[PDB]
């Protein structure tokens, strides 16, 4: 699109390699640090899309 179609997405992080033909729809925040995080985006955990 001239203005830029941004409705196509792709997952960036996942804790494990998915098995053949798997799909996933969960959009829960992906944590990187050992200390668990929750709520919204911030440090050591982000949006996986």
């Amino acid at each position, epitope marked *: 699109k001239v203005s830029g179609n941004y409705n196509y997405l792709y997952r*960036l*992080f996942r804790k494990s390699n998915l098995k053949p033909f798997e799909r996933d729809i969960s959009t829960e925040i992906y944590q*990187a*640090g*050992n*200390k668990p995080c929750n709520g919204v*985006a*911030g*440090f*050591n955990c*982000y*949006f996986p899309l």
Partner: antibody
Amino acid sequence: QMQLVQSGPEVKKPGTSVKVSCKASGFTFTDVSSLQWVRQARGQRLEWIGWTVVGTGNTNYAPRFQERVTITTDKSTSTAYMELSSLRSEDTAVYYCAAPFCSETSCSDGFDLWGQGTKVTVS
Amino acid sequence: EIVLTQSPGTLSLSPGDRATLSCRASQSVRISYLAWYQQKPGQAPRLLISGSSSRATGIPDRFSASGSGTDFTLTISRLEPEDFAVYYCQQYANSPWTFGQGTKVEV
């Protein structure tokens, strides 16, 4: 070794812009790894400027620095670019870029790596 | 929007003694997003304790973190003559992060 190198001190003139960069020694920007920038003046407290995410592309900026500084990252070259416009005498200080030992999509909350810093002075 | 106050302002203790420092926050309470730093003159600051509950790489057992509430505390068991530096508390959990002012220890 896990170490970060940065350019040397520079002197510039008013009415000009400065591009600042710092590189690593075998460290990869990847996606999970994120680097922040700090500045230290002569006998002054440390101030936070901004940190960016190489993978998602999200950036954070200070409200004071929301109009004349830009931070970008390039994973392929694993470099960080700061464009600073209208550098005054108050902007003459030492810059440091810090990132954690962030590999294999896992890393703690502490930034161990610490660059030497660039002494930027504009007269 | 978070201001940290580091106390005491200055120190002068015999080497090898036990010292403790504290720092003050005014925003919401968080204990795992605080870090302690030392900056030597002519060198970049170095991290000592991250998250107030874990040590960094190569950090000796000299530095011990404490505190549960809004206060944040650190303790040094022995003041070996190279430990003289400045201390900074830094928070992570809030809207744009901000350091402290700095606690200086003297001989």
